[PDB]
Every structure is written in C-alpha cells, then in structure tokens.
Curated annotation (Swiss-Prot), chains A, B:
Free-text domain note: The SH2 2 domain is required for interaction with FBXL2 and PTPN13.
Positions bearing the site annotation: Arginine finger: R39
Rho-GAP domain location: 1-166
Entry PTM: Phosphorylated in response to signaling from activated receptor-type protein kinases. Dephosphorylated by PTPRJ. Ubiquitinated. Polyubiquitination by the SCF(FBXL2) complex probably promotes proteasomal degradation of PIK3R2.
UniProt subunit comment: Heterodimer of a regulatory subunit PIK3R2 and a p110 catalytic subunit (PIK3CA, PIK3CB or PIK3CD). Interacts with AXL. Interacts with FLT1 (tyrosine-phosphorylated) and FLT4 (tyrosine-phosphorylated). Interacts with NYAP1, NYAP2 and MYO16. Interacts with FBXL2; PIK3R2 is a substrate of the SCF(FBXL2) complex. Interacts with PTPN13; dephosphorylates PIK3R2. Interacts with XBP1 isoform 2; the interaction is direct and induces translocation of XBP1 isoform 2 into the nucleus in a ER stress- and/or insulin-dependent but PI3K-independent manner.
Role, per record: Regulatory subunit of phosphoinositide-3-kinase (PI3K), a kinase that phosphorylates PtdIns(4,5)P2 (Phosphatidylinositol 4,5-bisphosphate) to generate phosphatidylinositol 3,4,5-trisphosphate (PIP3). PIP3 plays a key role by recruiting PH domain-containing proteins to the membrane, including AKT1 and PDPK1, activating signaling cascades involved in cell growth, survival, proliferation, motility and morphology.
Gene from which this protein is expressed: PIK3R2
Family: Belongs to the PI3K p85 subunit family.
Disease: Megalencephaly-polymicrogyria-polydactyly-hydrocephalus syndrome 1: A syndrome characterized by megalencephaly, hydrocephalus, and polymicrogyria; polydactyly may also be seen. There is considerable phenotypic similarity between this disorder and the megalencephaly-capillary malformation syndrome.
Name of the featured protein: Phosphatidylinositol 3-kinase regulatory subunit beta
Species name: Homo sapiens (Human)
Amino acid sequence: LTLPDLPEQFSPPDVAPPLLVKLVEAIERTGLDSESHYRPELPAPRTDWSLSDVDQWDTAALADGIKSFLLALPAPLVTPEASAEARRALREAPVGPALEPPTLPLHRALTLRFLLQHLGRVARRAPALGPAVRALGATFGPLLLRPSPDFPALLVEKLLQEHLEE
Amino acid sequence: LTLPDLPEQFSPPDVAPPLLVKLVEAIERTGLDSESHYRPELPAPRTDWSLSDVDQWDTAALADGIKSFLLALPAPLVTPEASAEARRALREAPVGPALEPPTLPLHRALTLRFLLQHLGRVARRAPALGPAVRALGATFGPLLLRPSPDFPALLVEKLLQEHLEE
Ligand SMILES: [Cl-]
Ligand SMILES: [Cl-]
C-alpha cells in the first residue's frame, strides 16, 4: 500500500506533504492531550488515502494515520546516507545539520521538520518534557529509519531535544 | 486502493498530478505508436504508487497505470455537477466550457486538460484520426465519469474533437 515518493507528493511553495499536513492539523485541533501519539504498535495497513472524512476521525485514527504515512513511503523518510551521517555525528557528539540538505534531500528534510514541529507540540503538552521526548523517540525512530539497536530512537530523541532548545 | 483527492496531490505552479505526469511522459518517450491506450479492459488493482521503476515499464503497464490513476481517485475526475452541465450542453448542441472552473474545480480541470493533450497526441499517431478519437472516447469516458448509456464516451469524444480543432 505504497504512496508516491515525497518529491511526487508536493513541491515548493508547499513545505510538507498535504496528507501529513491534513492529519497533523486535524490532530492538533482535537487531541494534543492524547496518549495515542506515544503508542509504538503498528496500525492496520492503510489502503484508503482519500482522507475524505479525516475531520471526523478520533485521535487514535489520526495518530495511526501519521504512522501509516511514514510506513507507506517507498523508502524511509531518513535516508541510509543521512542515517549514517547522523550516526557519525551522534557517536562523536548536534545531529540536526546531518538531517538537512544536501545530506537529507529537500522534500524529506521539510517533511522531517514538519513532523518534529508536531512532535514538539505533543511533547510540551505532556506532564514531563524529558520522558515525553524519550517515549516519542522510541515510537517514531523505527518509523523514520526502518551499531546500537536503539539508534533510531536515540536519533529522534536528540533531534526533538534540539528542536525544543531553539 | 485510493489515492488522495486531486487538491492534495498537487498545487500551482504545477499544472497536473505528478503521478499522471510521470506516466504520460514515460509513455510518450517510448510508446505513442501503441494500441494499448485504446484497450477498455480494467487493469489489476494497483497498490504500489511509488512509480520507483516507471521508466523501465512497457507501454501496456504505463497505459494501465494511467487507467489505474483515474480509477484510484476518491471520486471521478469529472464531477456529477460538471457531467450534468456537459450533458445539458451536449444535448442542446461546444462542451469544453462546461468542464472548466468553476463548473469543474481547478485541479480536476487542469488534470483533464493534461490528459486530453496526451490523448490528442495518441489520436494523431493513429492511421485515421476520427476512428481513433472514437475508440479513445469509448475507453476513457467511463474512467472519467464512472440518459444515453454512451454519454461518457460521447462526451470525451467531443472534448477530444474540440481539443484537436484548436
Ligand atoms: Cl526526498
Ligand atoms: Cl478538484
């Protein structure tokens, strides 16, 4: 159930994929105070990407939608090249630059930025920022990357931490 | 196996959906002299819309891709409102204006124009223009619209005829 690659989903002056934008805007009107964002379970495979009734969806459906979007891309959001460059920076410890162009291509970088902005807003609603950032890393790491076995989680955790600093 | 609606697939300054653009450009480099465009049989349902290897596809696969694109939209390319306004013009006989904004929304009109341009190029490769235009109407009519039972075919036939005049 594979979506087009990110360059085929949007172009500047748009700064994020419309499907992701629709899910994020929906979920942020209704359910930023939800635990659903933090759930690492994979949703049932999505075949209907119309989002025809997305504004009537419950927070769980929307959170699942965001996860399904990431899993539906033909290749992971964070590329192997970008992963390896983050890994080298993260090991030799700011990972942020590693996940920007040219290292991470424009569409992917924009998409990652849009997602991190959303995940920051979720984190800030939580009772404790640090634990939230950690839980969100554990959930979204594997979705974005698809050697330490927690590297994906640690990378997203650090990227979110850096976003929140700024 | 439903794609996003056309407004979620592209925005100006793009003038057509990238997936359709990729299939059309592919098919027009390789196989404008093919009978495959004229085949009314429905393709197997497509679930992979990555087009990751689209430039290695045979003409039959590409022609099927274009048909699958039209069938994968959440609602027909030509709206019921636009269909009824074309039907009234076509009955009282130029249908063209009826399938332009506001009657047919911007994204759909742009997409229809891009497709008709492609179908015109196919028609002009054929041994006889009139018969080709008729065969293409019969094939694409039902895909675009989803009372005369040949109305969809007649509408596309006339729209293509009008395009070729200009
Ligand atoms: Cl990209
Ligand atoms: Cl539209």
